[PDB]
């Protein structure tokens, strides 16, 4: 996987060039935002269970056909499997937020996920809706003004939303 720093390095190496002054300054500015990034990872991580369950509730409320007899998510083992997928995706989204690069999420989670669901008969479009639900729940927790030093977290919040949206699109 790449992190925000090595992503730049790989692009520079593949060209045989040193990082330009502006690229070094861009990375420096990323370092300045460090605390906001780590807070986001800490807050989503510390609220993982609540984020998955609340998103799961909303999902099944809007798509009741998934949980009625015959539904892909009917029965304990399938429901548990579905809940587990939600958590897996969330876990990998925190890894990407932590490193500042989508590679880990793409390579170790999303790659081939659409094909896997199609073979199992899992409704991908419904998974995507679940991911969107987790985004809403997770971002409200991330951007909660209480118990945290005041500041503008717009950019990091946008970046995280991007990882969730990438996850939803990968299976929708």
């Amino acid at each position: 996987m790449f992190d925000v720093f090595t992503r730049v390095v790989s692009q520079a190496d593949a060209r045989g060039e040193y990082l330009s002054g502006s690229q070094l300054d861009a990375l420096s500015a990323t370092v300045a935002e460090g605390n906001k990034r780590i807070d986001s990872v800490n807050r989503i991580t510390g609220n993982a269970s609540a984020i998955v369950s609340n998103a799961a509730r909303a999902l099944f409320a809007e798509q009741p056909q998934l949980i009625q007899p015959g539904g892909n998510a009917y029965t304990s083992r399938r429901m548990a499997a579905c809940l587990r997928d939600m958590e897996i995706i969330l876990r990998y989204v925190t890894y990407a937020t932590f490193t500042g690069d989508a590679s880990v999420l793409e390579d170790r989670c999303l790659n081939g996920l659409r094909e896997t669901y199609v073979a199992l008969g899992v409704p991908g479009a419904s998974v995507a809706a679940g991911v969107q639900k987790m985004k809403e729940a997770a971002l409200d927790i991330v951007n909660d003004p209480n118990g945290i030093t005041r500041g503008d977290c717009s950019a990091i919040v946008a970046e995280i939303a991007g990882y969730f949206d990438r996850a939803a699109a990968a299976v929708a």
Binding site: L19, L24, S28, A48, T99
Partner: protein, 162 residues
Amino acid sequence: MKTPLTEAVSTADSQGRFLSSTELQIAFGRLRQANAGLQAAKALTDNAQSLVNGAAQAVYNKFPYTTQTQGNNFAADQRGKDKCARDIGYYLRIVTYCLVAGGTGPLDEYLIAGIDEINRTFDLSPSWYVEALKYIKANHGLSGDARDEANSYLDYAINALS
């Protein structure tokens, strides 16, 4: 490429768990040292030519035969001297990448892995490069953390060559 950040993720992933406080603290440590690394990278970058040429001559000075015997693996001619300069340029450039990445990742994946096979196949002496590296360490003119950062990676490469 290994960096303090990717190793923390790899560890948590290999354990199927979310990152822990210890891992978050690891990120804080990385962030605190980042700027010294970026500043050292900038300094070395602005002196690439001087440092490269200066190191090339240093190697020829301690290993004069490399410019006197004939051979593809020697710099007795113009071509070989370009090869040599180029090689030294790779070492320097990749060391600035380590300073930017906050880890040895760039050196391990771009230059270290397989270097023994490369030197053995084209008959290049690891001592030539060890010499060029020492030169850099004594002519970059850095100081403080930026200096300690640069030298940590310069020594790493040296040990990999001996």
